[PDB]
Amino acid sequence: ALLSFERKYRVPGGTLVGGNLFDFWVGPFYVGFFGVATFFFAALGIILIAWSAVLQGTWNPQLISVYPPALEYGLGGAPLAKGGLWQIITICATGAFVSWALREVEICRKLGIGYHIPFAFAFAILAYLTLVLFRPVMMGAWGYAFPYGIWTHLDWVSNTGYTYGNFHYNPAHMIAISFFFTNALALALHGALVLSAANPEKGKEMRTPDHEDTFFRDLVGYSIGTLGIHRLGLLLSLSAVFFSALCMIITGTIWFDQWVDWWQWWVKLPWWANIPGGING
Amino acid sequence: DLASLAIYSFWIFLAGLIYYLQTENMREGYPLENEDGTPAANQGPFPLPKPKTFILPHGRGTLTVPGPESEDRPIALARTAVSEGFPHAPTGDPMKDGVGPASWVARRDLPELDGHGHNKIKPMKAAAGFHVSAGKNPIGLPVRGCDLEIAGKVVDIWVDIPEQMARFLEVELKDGSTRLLPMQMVKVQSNRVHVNALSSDLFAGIPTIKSPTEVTLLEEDKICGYVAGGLMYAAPKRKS
Amino acid sequence: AEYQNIFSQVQVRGPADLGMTEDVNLANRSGVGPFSTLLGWFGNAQLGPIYLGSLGVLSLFSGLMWFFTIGIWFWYQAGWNPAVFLRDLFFFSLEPPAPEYGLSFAAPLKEGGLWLIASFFMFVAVWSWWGRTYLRAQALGMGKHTAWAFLSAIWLWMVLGFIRPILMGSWSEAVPYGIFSHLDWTNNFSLVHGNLFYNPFHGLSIAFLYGSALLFAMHGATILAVSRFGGERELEQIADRGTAAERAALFWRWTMGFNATMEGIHRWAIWMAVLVTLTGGIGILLSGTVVDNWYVWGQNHG
Numbered sequence A: 001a002l003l004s005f006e007r008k009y010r011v012p013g014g015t016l017v018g019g020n021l022f023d024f025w026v027g028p029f030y031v032g033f034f035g036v037a038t039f040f041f042a043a044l045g046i047i048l049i050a051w052s053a054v055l056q057g058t059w060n061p062q063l064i065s066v067y068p069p070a071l072e073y074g075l076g077g078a079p080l081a082k083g084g085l086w087q088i089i090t091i092c093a094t095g096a097f098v099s100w101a102l103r104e105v106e107i108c109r110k111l112g113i114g115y116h117i118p119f120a121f122a123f124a125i126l127a128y129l130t131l132v133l134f135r136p137v138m139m140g141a142w143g144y145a146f147p148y149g150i151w152t153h154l155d156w157v158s159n160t161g162y163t164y165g166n167f168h169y170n171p172a173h174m175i176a177i178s179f180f181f182t183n184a185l186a187l188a189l190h191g192a193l194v195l196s197a198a199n200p201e202k203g204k205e206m207r208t209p210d211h212e213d214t215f216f217r218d219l220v221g222y223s224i225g226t227l228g229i230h231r232l233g234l235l236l237s238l239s240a241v242f243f244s245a246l247c248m249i250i251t252g253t254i255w256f257d258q259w260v261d262w263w264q265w266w267v268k269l270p271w272w273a274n275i276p277g278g279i280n281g
Numbered sequence B: 001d002l003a004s005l006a007i008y009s010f011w012i013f014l015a016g017l018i019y020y021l022q023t024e025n026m027r028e029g030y031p032l033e034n035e036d037g038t039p040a041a042n043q044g045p046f047p048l049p050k051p052k053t054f055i056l057p058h059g060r061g062t063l064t065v066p067g068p069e070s071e072d073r074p075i076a077l078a079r080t081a082v083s084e085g086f087p088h089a090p091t092g093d094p095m096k097d098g099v100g101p102a103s104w105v106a107r108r109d110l111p112e113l114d115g116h117g118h119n120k121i122k123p124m125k126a127a128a129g130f131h132v133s134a135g136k137n138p139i140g141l142p143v144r145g146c147d148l149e150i151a152g153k154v155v156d157i158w159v160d161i162p163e164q165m166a167r168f169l170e171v172e173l174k175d176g177s178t179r180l181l182p183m184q185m186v187k188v189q190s191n192r193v194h195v196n197a198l199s200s201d202l203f204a205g206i207p208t209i210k211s212p213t214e215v216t217l218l219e220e221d222k223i224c225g226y227v228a229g230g231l232m233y234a235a236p237k238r239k240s
Numbered sequence C: 001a002e003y004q005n006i007f008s009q010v011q012v013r014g015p016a017d018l019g020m021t022e023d024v025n026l027a028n029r030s031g032v033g034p035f036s037t038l039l040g041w042f043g044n045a046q047l048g049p050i051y052l053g054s055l056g057v058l059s060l061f062s063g064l065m066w067f068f069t070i071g072i073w074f075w076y077q078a079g080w081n082p083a084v085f086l087r088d089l090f091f092f093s094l095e096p097p098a099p100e101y102g103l104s105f106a107a108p109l110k111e112g113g114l115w116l117i118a119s120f121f122m123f124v125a126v127w128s129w130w131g132r133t134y135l136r137a138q139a140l141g142m143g144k145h146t147a148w149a150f151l152s153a154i155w156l157w158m159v160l161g162f163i164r165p166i167l168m169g170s171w172s173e174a175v176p177y178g179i180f181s182h183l184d185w186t187n188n189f190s191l192v193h194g195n196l197f198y199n200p201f202h203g204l205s206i207a208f209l210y211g212s213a214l215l216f217a218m219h220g221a222t223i224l225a226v227s228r229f230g231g232e233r234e235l236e237q238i239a240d241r242g243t244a245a246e247r248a249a250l251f252w253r254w255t256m257g258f259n260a261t262m263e264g265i266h267r268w269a270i271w272m273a274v275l276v277t278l279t280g281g282i283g284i285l286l287s288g289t290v291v292d293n294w295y296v297w298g299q300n301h302g
């Protein structure tokens, strides 16, 4: 059940709630108060999904979908079968995600490490909450949230996107996509870099960090360093998700026409708005 | 059709790859053990991979993994319950015994070396010609513990030469000797350095180094563990 | 809160790090550039040296040539007017030959030939830059992992601009050089192919793109959380596991019931990332060549 070095770390303490009541493990898994909360919310949520599947009349995972209340309900409670289940499942999911993060904090405390992981995960939760809570509340209806279904969630992405034309033209979406693409690039490189040093040409000695710096400086004239790359990946991926949330919190609220037309303010600036030639004259 | 062949092949490739990735990640800490040190009955469905061998530079030998796994140190903990899966209470002082969040690993009792075989980390006063180049210079500042008391004064910065970065503050105690504090566990303010992890009376406790101008992997682990462990074990005297 | 390790509190500097020699021809290395106090709050202050070399030069020159061919055409589309140039910057586009020219190089300058010339300079800039990722690792006796990962990105690129057009039978299938126009191409490609959301490789590609943000978030955060135990010194932790690597692994084991090692995480990383363009390239390559309509394909399950 334990890794060969694990026992020295398995001491009492670090919990946030309940002293030592839940201060124990199950196999590899730490429990704690929030381990217990997580189980409760997740199990309720799954049971409610299964019920929803029975009412929907199917057990196929490709088919089961849980839709929010229709727009006519606004921000009220819908009858269980007409969107209410979606509403309780959404409370459960948030319960589970937040509980998961708080459990991670308890683990950090036990291990004497920094809180970076749960804090990073908090960005993912916030993006989720943007789509299902913040944006719908701002727009006046639960029905604007995405449905819980493997394929139907993708219908929502398409319909929402095309409601504003080609979603590519959301400027905040462009920044977001850029952080995503740059992240994947940096992950490839950090991975490759470390492995190329740890696993040199056949028969050579392991290279050093100096060789990593050297390699990169040689290639592009800069190296961010080893602290920097881990700061970088954290920043890039957290920023991707920040601008993802931003790009949606603004859609259907402060801007609701075709995103392509937002770009017109630049073209219609007095000093060149009227000059002929080019594409727009 | 070809697309179907391609997607179906890709899923097989992906299972293999997850298998490869999971086995690669079992080159340390395995085989699993019971709470007493002995191989566990249940090892999981993934086998250990064939060993691989790292040639270490500067004649320091090799590392072969997986291989015989040993703590190489006493562990001052005892069971608190009759069944599997509960915490193990420290039998002594967990700061001194190096357990819990005060834990250290028994790494090589030599210093990390740079690409040229020189010591990776030196005190700045012996690194030609390193200097503080931005931010508040901590050298000279009084060092405050989380009991809000002074425990010493910063007498130098230990620097990572090849990465030109600050790693430790060297801190002089009331008795003339020094201790390394990890850079990541101090707050440099304008009129002091603050250490949240430690109360002032725990500073004498920081593991000392054996040669005053170098530090070994082993000693670094002992220093960092001790200081981190303070967050849990010094909390009765805090006040943050 | 206490110190977080996002920005350094104190910067230190010493002699310029000229770097490891190994088999590197030092004749071809610059000297340092300036030190950026700004950059050094976050990463390294030192700029340079870089490594020149013939391929370096060829790649760099060919790269500029590409950029300049697109730019000349932009100016020309602006009717040489600077104020129109800035105004319609994102609207300019250098387009490939029309279908009727098939794969021939006949196409007139203003009507496809300039796109081909730019594509030529791009083809040589990129491949020669690839040779560069290989040779620079070689000269230092390192594994070829970077050149190996770069090949995945190259694959998608190649498929978009070169392999697919050739297979489709015409350069008009390729991607225009322009900010807004490359987006429009992207949106039309999907529309014309029955919506890429039904392309199983588009789905996987998304999983790995999102996966990379998840993983780099996880890894980046984990290393900074254990940087107080020297965690970021990843190679020495590989060679001689410390309390950093152990607390790292145990965090994840306690959280989700399994964990990585200091070396193995970097293998999850490299593969999460390269799988993005790997699956992506396959998804695109099959589009129009073997599958016309992904929705249709998906109805027959294949």
Ligand code: BCL
Residues within 6 Å of the ligand: A168, A173, A174, A175, A177, A178, A179, A181, A182, A185, C089, C157, C160, C175, C179, C182, C183, C186
């Ligand atoms: C993947 C499917 C589509 C496509 C889908 C999209 C979508 C959707 C978006 C982009 C966006 C980007 N795309 Mg595109 N992209 C395509 C493939 C390409 C290719 C290529 C095949 O070589 C290139 C160079 C670009 C590059 C561009 C950038 C302008 C922009 C940021 C990318 C990035 O962060 O990269 C990694 C980061 C780097 C470190 C290097 C890149 C830096 C930039 C500045 C260089 C690219 C071009 C450069 C010459 C810009 C000149 C600016 C002015 C004209 C002077 N795309 C293919 C055909 N791309 C986003 C955007 O904001 O567009 C406006 C966006 O929303």
Ligand code: BCL
Residues within 6 Å of the ligand: A097, A124, A125, A126, A127, A128, A130, A131, A156, A157, A158, A159, A160, A161, A162, A166, A167, A168, A173, A176, A177, A180, A241, A243, A244, A245, A246, A247, A248, C186
């Ligand atoms: C036709 C569709 C439109 C369009 C539709 C829109 C719409 C609509 C949206 C996006 C959004 C996204 N689009 Mg878009 N967009 C299009 C095409 C593009 C293209 C492209 C190359 O063509 C790209 C790269 C992107 C990229 C982007 C991203 C910036 C963003 C999604 C990431 C995200 O929000 O993560 C955020 C992270 C999460 C939401 C996941 C969090 C989950 C956590 C908290 C918990 C789950 C755990 C649990 C269930 C696990 C089970 C337990 C098991 C044991 C594992 N779009 C086209 C033009 N786009 C979305 C966005 O920005 O939303 C904020 C969005 O709503």
Ligand code: BCL
Residues within 6 Å of the ligand: A046, A049, A128, A131, A146, A150, A151, A153, A154, A157, C197, C202, C203, C204, C206, C207, C208, C210, C211, C214
């Ligand atoms: C983020 C912006 C958009 C988004 C747009 C897209 C698009 C576009 C695509 C997906 C696709 C995925 N999305 Mg989505 N979708 C979003 C909302 C989310 C949320 C959420 C907020 O809770 C979840 C759980 C999912 C998860 C799903 C997966 C089924 C699939 C692979 C994702 C992945 O590898 O992630 C990266 C993370 C990992 C690699 C970790 C793995 C965790 C996965 C496997 C968890 C799956 C849980 C799922 C089966 C729900 C069951 C929960 C149980 C009842 C416990 N999406 C919002 C609406 N999503 C792809 C697909 O093919 O779908 C058919 C796809 O093309």
Ligand code: BCL
Residues within 6 Å of the ligand: A157, A181, A184, C126, C153, C154, C156, C157, C160, C186, C187, C189, C190, C195, C196, C197, C201, C202, C205, C206, C209, C276, C277, C279, C280, C281, C283, C284
């Ligand atoms: C309306 C739009 C369509 C759709 C259109 C398509 C199309 C078309 C494509 C994608 C592709 C992808 N889509 Mg999609 N996309 C849809 C909606 C989504 C959504 C969503 C709805 O939320 C998401 C998250 C995604 C996102 C994704 C990505 C996973 C994937 C691109 C991978 C990549 O890293 O490329 C970025 C990386 C590269 C392009 C490689 C870079 C190559 C190198 C060699 C170039 C170097 C340039 C250098 C010379 C420039 C120098 C400048 C420097 C500064 C020096 N799509 C909808 C349904 N999508 C791509 C794919 O693979 O599909 C299978 C693709 O072709």
Ligand SMILES: CC[C@H]1c2cc3[nH]c4c(c3C)C(=O)[C@H](C(=O)OC)c4c3nc(cc4[nH]c(cc(n2)[C@@H]1C)c(C(C)=O)c4C)[C@@H](C)[C@@H]3CCC(=O)OC/C=C(\C)CCC[C@H](C)CCC[C@H](C)CCCC(C)C
Residues within 6 Å of the ligand: A038, A041, A042, A043, A045, A046, A089, A092, A093, A096, A097, A100, A104, A117, A118, A120, A121, A122, A123, A124, A147, A148, A149, A150, A153, A237, A238, A241, C210, C211, C213, C214, C217, C218, C221, C255, C256
């Ligand atoms: C902020 C940058 C990125 C990020 C970071 C991040 N994610 C993280 C972490 C961090 C640091 C955590 O530490 C945590 C983790 O433990 O990782 C293994 C996690 C995590 N990210 C996960 C998934 C995930 N993250 C996402 C992505 C991202 N996470 C961003 C890109 C996505 C995407 C891109 O779609 C997914 C799918 C999980 C593996 C894990 C959180 C696991 C967890 O919270 O478990 C507790 C709850 C359950 C076990 C299940 C609860 C079930 C619900 C009650 C019902 C389900 C309802 C749901 C809304 C249905 C959705 C239907 C879909 C078809 C749409």
Ligand SMILES: CC[C@H]1c2cc3[nH]c4c(c3C)C(=O)[C@H](C(=O)OC)c4c3nc(cc4[nH]c(cc(n2)[C@@H]1C)c(C(C)=O)c4C)[C@@H](C)[C@@H]3CCC(=O)OC/C=C(\C)CCC[C@H](C)CCC[C@H](C)CCCC(C)C
Residues within 6 Å of the ligand: A181, A182, A184, A185, A188, A189, A192, A219, A220, C059, C060, C062, C063, C064, C067, C125, C126, C127, C129, C130, C133, C146, C147, C149, C150, C151, C152, C153, C273, C274, C275, C276, C277
């Ligand atoms: C999943 C894999 C991800 C990935 C992989 C990847 N990309 C990589 C690498 C790998 C591992 C390589 O090692 C290679 C690299 O060297 O990176 C540092 C690369 C690379 N990917 C790059 C771009 C890139 N990758 C992207 C995609 C991805 N890369 C995926 C997300 C994208 C996107 C998302 O569209 C972009 C645009 C480059 C940074 C580099 C390839 C460099 C190259 O082929 O250059 C050829 C052309 C030139 C040398 C000159 C170009 C013309 C410039 C305008 C001149 C700049 C120089 C000038 C003298 C400076 C003047 C400055 C002024 C402009 C102010």
Ligand SMILES: COC(C)(C)C/C=C/C(C)=C/C=C/C(C)=C/C=C/C(C)=C/C=C\C=C(C)\C=C\C=C(/C)CC/C=C(\C)CCC=C(C)C
Residues within 6 Å of the ligand: C067, C068, C070, C071, C072, C074, C116, C119, C120, C122, C123, C157, C158, C159, C160, C161, C162, C175, C176, C177, C178, C179, C182
């Ligand atoms: C200020 O003005 C000056 C002139 C000084 C400079 C400014 C210039 C400007 C403004 C340039 C701006 C350029 C822009 C906006 C470029 C945008 C590029 C984008 C977004 C392209 C994205 C897609 C690119 C792809 C997919 C390219 C693939 C290319 C290939 C695979 C090459 C295929 C090879 C061919 C067809 C040639 C065949 C030859 C052989 C080898 C036989």
Ligand SMILES: COC1=C(OC)C(=O)C(C/C=C(/C)CCC=C(C)C)=C(C)C1=O
Residues within 6 Å of the ligand: A185, A186, A187, A189, A190, A193, A212, A213, A216, A222, A223, A224, A225, A229, C043
């Ligand atoms: C393998 O890790 C990597 C580094 O190598 C050690 C880098 O350094 C960078 C490049 C980062 C930055 C901030 C460039 C900015 C520099 C200038 C000239 C303004 C990336 C992406 C990376 O992946």
Ligand SMILES: CCCCCCCCCCCC[N+](C)(C)[O-]
Residues within 6 Å of the ligand: A049, A061, A064, A065, A066, A148, A149, A150
């Ligand atoms: C609300 C979304 C639909 C519920 C999905 C059903 C849970 C089973 C696990 C999902 C994975 C699909 N799978 C592997 C069974 O095909």
Ligand SMILES: CCCCCCCCCCCC[N+](C)(C)[O-]
Residues within 6 Å of the ligand: A175, A178, A179, A182
């Ligand atoms: C390569 C590291 C530098 C980050 C570049 C990421 C590309 C997107 C840049 C947009 C920056 C927008 N921002 C954050 C300044 O508002």
Ligand SMILES: CCCCCCCCCCCC[N+](C)(C)[O-]
Residues within 6 Å of the ligand: B135, C007, C008, C009, C038, C039, C041, C042
């Ligand atoms: C992504 C690279 C650019 C990062 C530059 C950010 C500069 C921030 C400066 C904060 C300095 C912190 N402080 C006050 C302790 O010195």
Ligand SMILES: CCCCCCCCCCCC[N+](C)(C)[O-]
Residues within 6 Å of the ligand: A220, A221, A222, C030, C031, C032, C033, C034, C047, C048, C049, C050
């Ligand atoms: C992608 C990062 C690009 C970094 C550029 C390479 C820097 C080389 C600087 C050498 C020139 C010295 N300088 C600027 C003082 O003249």
Ligand SMILES: CCCCCCCCCCCC[N+](C)(C)[O-]
Residues within 6 Å of the ligand: C199, C200, C201, C202, C203, C204, C207, C211, C268, C271, C272
């Ligand atoms: C490094 C490997 C990480 C493993 C991630 C695999 C997640 C599978 C995502 C499902 C994609 C579904 N579909 C139908 C579009 O193919």
Ligand SMILES: CCCCCCCCCCCC[N+](C)(C)[O-]
Residues within 6 Å of the ligand: A027, A028, B044, C256, C257, C258
């Ligand atoms: C794609 C997500 C599927 C969920 C399964 C994830 C694997 C984690 C399994 C942990 C192993 C449990 N253990 C150690 C008790 O056997």
Ligand SMILES: CCCCCCCCCCCC[N+](C)(C)[O-]
Residues within 6 Å of the ligand: A028, B018, B022, B043, B044, B045, B046, C257, C258, C259
């Ligand atoms: C796509 C990610 C898949 C994650 C699941 C792979 C490993 C799950 C659990 C591994 C076994 C842990 N164990 C029992 C060896 O300790």
Ligand SMILES: [Fe+3]
Residues within 6 Å of the ligand: A190, A194, A230, C219, C223, C234, C266
């Ligand atoms: Fe790393």
